[PDB]
Design a protein around this ligand. Structure first.
Ligand SMILES: CC(C)C[C@H](C(=O)NO)N(Cc1ccccc1)[P@](C)(=O)c1ccccc1
Ligand SMILES: [Ca+2]
Ligand SMILES: [Ca+2]
Ligand SMILES: [Ca+2]
Ligand SMILES: [Ca+2]
Ligand SMILES: [Ca+2]
Ligand SMILES: [Ca+2]
Ligand SMILES: [Zn+2]
Ligand SMILES: [Zn+2]
Ligand SMILES: [Zn+2]
Ligand SMILES: [Zn+2]
Lengths: 173, 169
């Protein structure tokens, strides 16, 4: 596991998120659900909790975007980069943009929104790409078939807990 | 060495323990000894002292369990998770649970109770997992030669003394 230079992490254990816009690919309910589940995989293993804002600035601003969209890094169209998120800090930092030139899906027939969102919220919380092949934070999105079998690898757990630690209600093996 | 978030520790030097139940794998004298030797490895390097209770709520409640027991974290059958313990605080905190789907032994022929109890009571006192490979608080501590060549690494000593200080002698 790797982190971002300076090890920027949030100071608050409770963060807010806002879903700024919506994709034509999925109905609004499917987007909100995939976002909630993505955050949930990180809450499970840390003292972090997340709430939803519908107006104003939230720590993690989530949006969909194509090509030039108002930040320093434009999207590349269909394929290649599916999404990008920033390390913790004020403002643009901690935000997660998703490339809408991809076909966002609830299952595995295009690009699963939940899988990538989980990988991005990792970035928004302070994890950089991992050198461990089976970690969620490994930079290679691929041919996955079972969302039923989704369990964060030990490397991801060791990485997010080196920043935030395990939940206070959790015993340690 | 690592410490839990918000560095929670016990706000007192004297702690109590209670062995709530016993495992069918071993005689009762060996469970008591394995736990008492496990308490001693930490006492020797800190001003922490312990006392045993046989009724009431003790700081460190010790029991054996299988699958779903008194909490939200069920055990997973033979092997893998051997036991789990909570960080300092009231209630379920500080408590150590042991998986009875493991074969607890007083030697190296199943899951050695002393070695695992020493690690778990580490958690109970405020130590999270260490990156040092020869430290008791390292996840894969289940390799150490537990009685002949067992020695608390300087890393564990550093870790526990950061929280409680060196012996007062
Ligand atoms: C640089 C970064 C935008 C790359 C980005 C990513 O990891 N998002 O956090 N991508 C990696 C990438 C792009 C092009 C060539 C090789 C690898 P992806 C395809 O968007 C990515 C998204 C979700 C899980 C794993 C990877
Ligand atoms: Ca932000
Ligand atoms: Ca793209
Ligand atoms: Ca799209
Ligand atoms: Ca207790
Ligand atoms: Ca087990
Ligand atoms: Ca047993
Ligand atoms: Zn962007
Ligand atoms: Zn990434
Ligand atoms: Zn442990
Ligand atoms: Zn338990």
């Amino acid at each position: 596991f790797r982190t971002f230079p300076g090890i920027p992490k949030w100071r608050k254990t409770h963060l807010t998120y806002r879903i700024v816009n919506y994709t034509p690919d999925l109905p609004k309910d499917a987007v909100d659900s995939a976002v909630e589940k993505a955050l949930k995989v990180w809450e499970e293993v840390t003292p972090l909790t997340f709430s939803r804002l519908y107006e104003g600035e939230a720590d993690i601003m989530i949006s969909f975007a194509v090509r030039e969209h108002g930040d320093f890094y434009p999207f590349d169209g269909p394929g290649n980069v599916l999404a990008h998120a920033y390390a913790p800090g004020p403002g643009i930092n901690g935000d997660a943009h998703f490339d809408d030139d991809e076909q966002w899906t609830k299952d595995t027939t295009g690009t699963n929104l939940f899988l990538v969102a989980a990988h991005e919220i990792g970035h928004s919380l302070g994890l950089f790409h991992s050198a461990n092949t089976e970690a969620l934070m490994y930079p290679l999105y691929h041919s996955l078939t079972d969302l039923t079998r989704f369990r964060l690898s030990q490397d991801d757990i060791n990485g997010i807990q080196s920043l935030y630690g395990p939940p206070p209600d959790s015993p340690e093996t």
